[PDB]
Write an enzyme that holds these catalytic residues in place. Structure first.
Site, PDB file in Angstrom:
ATOM      1  N   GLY A 119       0.789  -1.186   0.000  1.00 22.09           N
ATOM      2  CA  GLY A 119       0.000   0.000   0.000  1.00 22.09           C
ATOM      3  C   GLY A 119       0.830   1.248   0.000  1.00 22.09           C
ATOM      4  O   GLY A 119       2.049   1.200   0.302  1.00 22.09           O
ATOM      5  N   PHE A 120       0.131   2.343  -0.339  1.00 23.91           N
ATOM      6  CA  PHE A 120       0.646   3.704  -0.430  1.00 23.91           C
ATOM      7  C   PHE A 120       0.184   4.553   0.755  1.00 23.91           C
ATOM      8  O   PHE A 120      -1.004   4.869   0.890  1.00 23.91           O
ATOM      9  CB  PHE A 120       0.197   4.381  -1.767  1.00 23.91           C
ATOM     10  CG  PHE A 120       1.055   5.573  -2.140  1.00 23.91           C
ATOM     11  CD1 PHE A 120       2.433   5.408  -2.375  1.00 23.91           C
ATOM     12  CD2 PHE A 120       0.524   6.843  -2.159  1.00 23.91           C
ATOM     13  CE1 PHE A 120       3.222   6.479  -2.613  1.00 23.91           C
ATOM     14  CE2 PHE A 120       1.342   7.960  -2.426  1.00 23.91           C
ATOM     15  CZ  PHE A 120       2.697   7.777  -2.635  1.00 23.91           C
ATOM     16  N   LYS A 126      -8.327   6.437   9.670  1.00 20.96           N
ATOM     17  CA  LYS A 126      -8.129   6.205  11.096  1.00 20.96           C
ATOM     18  C   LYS A 126      -8.770   7.309  11.929  1.00 20.96           C
ATOM     19  O   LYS A 126      -8.678   8.489  11.588  1.00 20.96           O
ATOM     20  CB  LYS A 126      -6.637   6.102  11.419  1.00 20.96           C
ATOM     21  CG  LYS A 126      -5.837   5.294  10.410  1.00 20.96           C
ATOM     22  CD  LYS A 126      -4.362   5.261  10.774  1.00 20.96           C
ATOM     23  CE  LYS A 126      -3.549   4.530   9.717  1.00 20.96           C
ATOM     24  NZ  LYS A 126      -2.937   5.471   8.738  1.00 20.96           N
ATOM     25  N   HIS A 166      -6.101   4.952  15.596  1.00 17.02           N
ATOM     26  CA  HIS A 166      -4.757   5.364  15.205  1.00 17.02           C
ATOM     27  C   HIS A 166      -3.752   5.091  16.319  1.00 17.02           C
ATOM     28  O   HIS A 166      -2.790   4.346  16.130  1.00 17.02           O
ATOM     29  CB  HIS A 166      -4.739   6.847  14.832  1.00 17.02           C
ATOM     30  CG  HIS A 166      -3.673   7.209  13.844  1.00 17.02           C
ATOM     31  ND1 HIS A 166      -3.847   8.181  12.884  1.00 17.02           N
ATOM     32  CD2 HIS A 166      -2.420   6.727  13.669  1.00 17.02           C
ATOM     33  CE1 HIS A 166      -2.747   8.284  12.159  1.00 17.02           C
ATOM     34  NE2 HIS A 166      -1.866   7.412  12.615  1.00 17.02           N
ATOM     35  N   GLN A 174      -1.432  -2.026  12.796  1.00 12.70           N
ATOM     36  CA  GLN A 174      -0.514  -1.253  11.999  1.00 12.70           C
ATOM     37  C   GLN A 174       0.496  -0.587  12.871  1.00 12.70           C
ATOM     38  O   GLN A 174       0.151   0.238  13.696  1.00 12.70           O
ATOM     39  CB  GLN A 174      -1.281  -0.183  11.145  1.00 12.70           C
ATOM     40  CG  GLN A 174      -0.361   0.631  10.350  1.00 12.70           C
ATOM     41  CD  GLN A 174      -1.044   1.683   9.470  1.00 12.70           C
ATOM     42  OE1 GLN A 174      -0.623   2.845   9.451  1.00 12.70           O
ATOM     43  NE2 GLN A 174      -2.052   1.276   8.699  1.00 12.70           N
ATOM     44  N   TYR A 180       4.532   0.252   8.663  1.00 14.00           N
ATOM     45  CA  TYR A 180       4.905   1.585   8.163  1.00 14.00           C
ATOM     46  C   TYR A 180       6.284   1.935   8.679  1.00 14.00           C
ATOM     47  O   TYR A 180       6.877   1.151   9.403  1.00 14.00           O
ATOM     48  CB  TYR A 180       3.851   2.691   8.481  1.00 14.00           C
ATOM     49  CG  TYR A 180       3.734   3.055   9.950  1.00 14.00           C
ATOM     50  CD1 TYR A 180       2.818   2.383  10.802  1.00 14.00           C
ATOM     51  CD2 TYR A 180       4.457   4.090  10.471  1.00 14.00           C
ATOM     52  CE1 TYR A 180       2.632   2.770  12.123  1.00 14.00           C
ATOM     53  CE2 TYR A 180       4.315   4.462  11.826  1.00 14.00           C
ATOM     54  CZ  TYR A 180       3.404   3.765  12.651  1.00 14.00           C
ATOM     55  OH  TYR A 180       3.310   4.125  13.999  1.00 14.00           O
ATOM     56  N   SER A 187       6.611   7.938  -1.191  1.00  9.07           N
ATOM     57  CA  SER A 187       7.683   8.702  -1.758  1.00  9.07           C
ATOM     58  C   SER A 187       7.153   9.940  -2.447  1.00  9.07           C
ATOM     59  O   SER A 187       6.053   9.932  -2.962  1.00  9.07           O
ATOM     60  CB  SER A 187       8.452   7.881  -2.800  1.00  9.07           C
ATOM     61  OG  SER A 187       9.589   8.630  -3.168  1.00  9.07           O
ATOM     62  N   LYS A 207       7.184   4.033  -8.487  1.00 14.64           N
ATOM     63  CA  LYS A 207       7.032   2.982  -9.485  1.00 14.64           C
ATOM     64  C   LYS A 207       7.867   1.757  -9.125  1.00 14.64           C
ATOM     65  O   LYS A 207       7.441   0.621  -9.334  1.00 14.64           O
ATOM     66  CB  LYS A 207       7.425   3.497 -10.871  1.00 14.64           C
ATOM     67  CG  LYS A 207       6.523   4.600 -11.401  1.00 14.64           C
ATOM     68  CD  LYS A 207       7.014   5.116 -12.745  1.00 14.64           C
ATOM     69  CE  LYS A 207       5.954   5.964 -13.431  1.00 14.64           C
ATOM     70  NZ  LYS A 207       6.347   6.325 -14.820  1.00 14.64           N
ATOM     71  N   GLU A 208       9.058   1.996  -8.585  1.00 14.50           N
ATOM     72  CA  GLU A 208       9.962   0.893  -8.169  1.00 14.50           C
ATOM     73  C   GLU A 208       9.359  -0.093  -7.184  1.00 14.50           C
ATOM     74  O   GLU A 208       9.760  -1.236  -7.152  1.00 14.50           O
ATOM     75  CB  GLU A 208      11.247   1.415  -7.552  1.00 14.50           C
ATOM     76  CG  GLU A 208      11.912   2.477  -8.358  1.00 14.50           C
ATOM     77  CD  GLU A 208      13.378   2.630  -7.982  1.00 14.50           C
ATOM     78  OE1 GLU A 208      13.693   2.394  -6.777  1.00 14.50           O
ATOM     79  OE2 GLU A 208      14.184   2.956  -8.898  1.00 14.50           O
ATOM     80  N   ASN A 209       8.433   0.361  -6.358  1.00 16.27           N
ATOM     81  CA  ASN A 209       7.750  -0.518  -5.404  1.00 16.27           C
ATOM     82  C   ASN A 209       7.200  -1.796  -5.986  1.00 16.27           C
ATOM     83  O   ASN A 209       7.279  -2.832  -5.331  1.00 16.27           O
ATOM     84  CB  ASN A 209       6.630   0.226  -4.712  1.00 16.27           C
ATOM     85  CG  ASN A 209       7.135   1.177  -3.676  1.00 16.27           C
ATOM     86  OD1 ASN A 209       7.249   2.381  -3.921  1.00 16.27           O
ATOM     87  ND2 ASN A 209       7.439   0.667  -2.521  1.00 16.27           N
TER      88      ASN A 209
END
Length: 315
Positions: free
Chosen positions: A18-19, A82, A115, A188, A214, A263, A270-272
């Protein structure tokens, strides 16, 4: 619903990558729009936001834009919000989730977390402070927040519920609650090679709970050696001709941990997806397990004096 996925204990599926949509404080909040569009074009389906980021308008606008022009449908998006410390009072949980849905222009979020396990004074200011800049702490029955979380699920306002930044005892309290209806689907927390969370991970898995990570990539302080400056991630990157980042990402995936990453740089975003392209070996996995040094980059220090501060117990 097409996905690199794991199932959660309520029968829903979450994308394993995830982002995150919390921004550097020096960014205009509008930046989360642009980044969300970029992450969507890169093939990300899981977006992670909270009331408190103040990014939920921009992210929803990003996602609605990419539905409108037909890149994605709503059902292809896994979206997380959250409830913040200031809205943990049971009446305040759904009010804050409904607000979030207003900001996003959604009908529902896919996931809704507590959260922290720490209440602050209601309401509007996210960091209620007194004369000397100290947070005004509040009391709440977390079991009652949970019950309120539970009704949000029943109302169809969220598809899953879980938590964030609970220690294992605070998780226990929830699970042992009389009349519990829904287990948290996830906890999380900060997770990386320097803080690999093995005991909490092992506890979560034993209770049918997914660990979502995270801080996954971690002036003197600022410029001293960093997590990705790590010699072993450095060599494994070259050994694989991937990045140090992508080693630490893949470490987590091979452990059955859901990864969030962010990022500001598109090429970085994109590399993810490269994380799906290779595999670390049993021995590299075990070497990487050896990096654990109880290094907590995100300790939430202003909360440190809160009775419910999660980061005191061992795990």
């Amino acid at each position: 619903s097409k996905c690199h996925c794991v199932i959660l204990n309520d029968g829903n599926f979450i994308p394993v990558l995830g982002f995150g949509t919390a921004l550097p404080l020096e960014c205009p909040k509008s930046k989360a729009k642009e980044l969300t569009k970029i992450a969507i074009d890169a093939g990300f389906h899981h977006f992670d936001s909270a009331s408190v980021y103040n990014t939920e308008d921009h992210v929803g606008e990003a996602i609605r834009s990419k539905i409108a022009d037909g890149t994605v449908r709503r059902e292809d998006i896994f979206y997380t919000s959250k409830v913040w410390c200031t809205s943990l009072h049971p009446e305040l949980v759904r009010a804050s989730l409904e607000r979030s849905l207003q900001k996003l222009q959604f009908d529902y979020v896919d996931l809704y977390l507590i959260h922290y396990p720490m209440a602050l004074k209601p309401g509007e200011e996210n960091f209620p402070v007194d004369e000397h800049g100290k947070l005004i702490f509040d009391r709440v029955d977390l079991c009652a927040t949970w019950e309120a979380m539970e009704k949000c699920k029943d109302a169809g306002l969220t598809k899953s519920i879980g938590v964030s930044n609970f220690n294992y005892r605070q998780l226990e309290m929830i699970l042992n609650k009389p009349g519990l209806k829904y287990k948290p689907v996830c906890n999380q927390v900060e997770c990386h090679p320097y803080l690999n969370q093995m005991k909490l991970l092992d506890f979560c898995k034993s209770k049918d709970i997914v660990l979502v990570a995270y801080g996954v990539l971690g002036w003197v302080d600022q410029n001293s050696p960093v997590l990705l400056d790590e010699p072993v991630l450095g060599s494994m990157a070259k050994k694989y001709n991937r990045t140090p980042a992508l080693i630490a990402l893949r470490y987590q995936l091979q452990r059955g941990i859901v990864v969030l990453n962010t990022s500001l740089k598109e090429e970085r975003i994109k590399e993810n997806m490269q994380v799906f392209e290779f595999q670390l070996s049993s021995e590299d996995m075990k070497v990487l397990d050896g990096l654990n040094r109880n290094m907590r980059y995100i300790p939430a220090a202003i909360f440190k004096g809160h009775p419910n501060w999660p980061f005191l117990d061992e795990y």
